[PDB]
């Protein structure tokens, strides 16, 4: 209570003293400034040249209090800008914090986990540096227990959060050898009862799946897709969000990888996802659907069997534009690879009207994506001879009148398909 509101100069004065206690008091004061909720004087702490002195206190084993005070202190300094996080790493904090992971005091080792989390969370460079210092083995060792429930709640949460940061960022992506080293424990954290652990766990996965098919594969081969589909139907939005992102990334890969999420029973959840109150959930859901309709024909059939086509029509009809744009993509991929019988069913569900009303939108790309679909539908109509019957349906919903305007559009690729449609069919 007597270390509240110290001046930065006072903190340096006590730390520069030859008295261990005086240093401890000043260090605790420095922390209380950083933990003051309104704009802490980080830059001033750095320009004072204290960081190096804080890092050296992390080594004082005999005095565990100052270890905690300094770990806490540096943690907040590392939570700032990349320039401020760089200062902590420059002070030689990485190897010091990794040493604290073996500390007998859980509350101290938790700070090391917290700190290293901020450092790796900065970017790929520091992420890889934390890994090169050998921070993974210690971290994973802290979770080497029969049951995770016995571990402290907050302690388990921060550990998970730190691990998710070591799987974060893309350019470059985390070392393959490091990802394999963490996955097994990540799959274990993906079955824990705590929601915050499941959330961060799903985010960790969503990071790994984000990339080439080789990255997606090593995650799929761990057999987590089923667990993700289970989490995909959770009540907590914070949990469903990353789960949907993960599944959304897995379906961007091979059709075999895409088939795994179908076998898991993911499509049975989309009736809720495609009508989910939150707008972004619909956008992510529809985006995932577009990567499924772009697969095989038997895969497109799965979507038809689950009666998800009507939902795509509803989302194409009334939703946030961003979501409606994803809907257009879903239809386009659906009409390009789907059979005639499939495209027919799509039309009888009432896809035309809502697909024509989106031609009024002022987005250059969606128009291309739509017109492309229209061409694909006619492409099937010719195989039935009912190109005339289709033209009429488009004409009765003020569709032709809008294609007439796109026939004279600025973008070159637009008027190409438009004029080609007016001429060939109308």
């Amino acid at each position: 209570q007597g270390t509240v509101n110290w001046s930065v100069e006072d903190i340096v004065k006590g730390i520069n003293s030859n008295n261990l206690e005086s240093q401890l008091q000043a260090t605790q004061a420095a922390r209380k400034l950083l933990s003051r909720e309104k704009q802490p004087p980080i830059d001033n702490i750095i320009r004072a040249g204290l960081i190096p002195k804080f890092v050296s206190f992390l080594g004082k084993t005999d005095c565990s209090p100052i270890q905690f005070e300094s770990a806490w202190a540096l943690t907040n300094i590392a939570s700032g800008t990349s320039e401020q996080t760089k200062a902590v790493v420059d002070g030689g904090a990485i190897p010091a914090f990794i040493s604290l992971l073996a500390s007998p005091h859980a509350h101290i080792s938790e700070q090391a986990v917290w700190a290293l989390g901020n450092i790796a969370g900065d970017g790929s460079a520091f992420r890889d540096l934390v890994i090169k210092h050998g921070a993974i083995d210690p971290l994973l060792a802290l979770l080497a227990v029969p049951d995770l429930s016995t571990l402290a709640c907050g302690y388990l949460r921060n550990l998970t959060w730190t691990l998710s940061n070591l799987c974060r960022n893309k350019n470059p992506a985390p070392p393959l050898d490091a990802v394999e080293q963490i996955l097994p424990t990540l799959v274990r954290l993906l079955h824990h009862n705590d929601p915050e652990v499941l959330a961060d766990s799903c985010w960790a996965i969503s990071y790994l799946t984000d990339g080439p098919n080789e990255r997606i594969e090593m995650v799929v081969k761990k057999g987590v897709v089923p667990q993700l589909v289970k989490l995909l139907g959770a009540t907590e939005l914070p949990i469903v969000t990353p789960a949907l992102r993960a599944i959304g990334n897995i379906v961007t890969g091979t059709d075999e990888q895409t088939q795994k999420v179908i076998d898991a029973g993911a499509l049975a959840v989309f009736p809720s996802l495609l009508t989910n109150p939150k707008t972004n959930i619909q956008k992510e859901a529809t985006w995932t659907m577009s990567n499924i309709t772009a697969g095989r024909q038997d895969q497109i059939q799965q979507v038809v069997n689950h009666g998800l086509v009507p939902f795509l029509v509803g989302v194409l009809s009334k939703a946030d534009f961003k979501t409606q744009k994803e809907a257009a993509w879903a239809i386009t991929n659906y009409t390009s690879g789907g059979t005639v019988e499939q495209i027919v069913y799509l039309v009888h569900c009432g896809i035309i009207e809502p697909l024509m009303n989106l031609l009024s939108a002022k987005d250059t790309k969606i128009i291309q994506v739509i017109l492309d679909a229209i061409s694909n539908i006619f492409q099937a109509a010719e195989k039935l001879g009912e190109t005339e019957k289709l033209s009429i349906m488009i004409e009765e919903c003020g569709g032709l009148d809008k294609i007439e305007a796109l026939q004279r559009h600025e973008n070159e690729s637009v008027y190409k398909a438009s004029l080609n449609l007016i001429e060939k069919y109308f």
Binding site: L34, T75, S79, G80, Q111
Partner: peptide
């Protein structure tokens, strides 16, 4: 793209 990649421990 999810949660903040940096946490400051500033309790009350």
């Amino acid at each position: 793209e999810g949660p903040s990649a940096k946490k400051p421990k500033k309790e009350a």
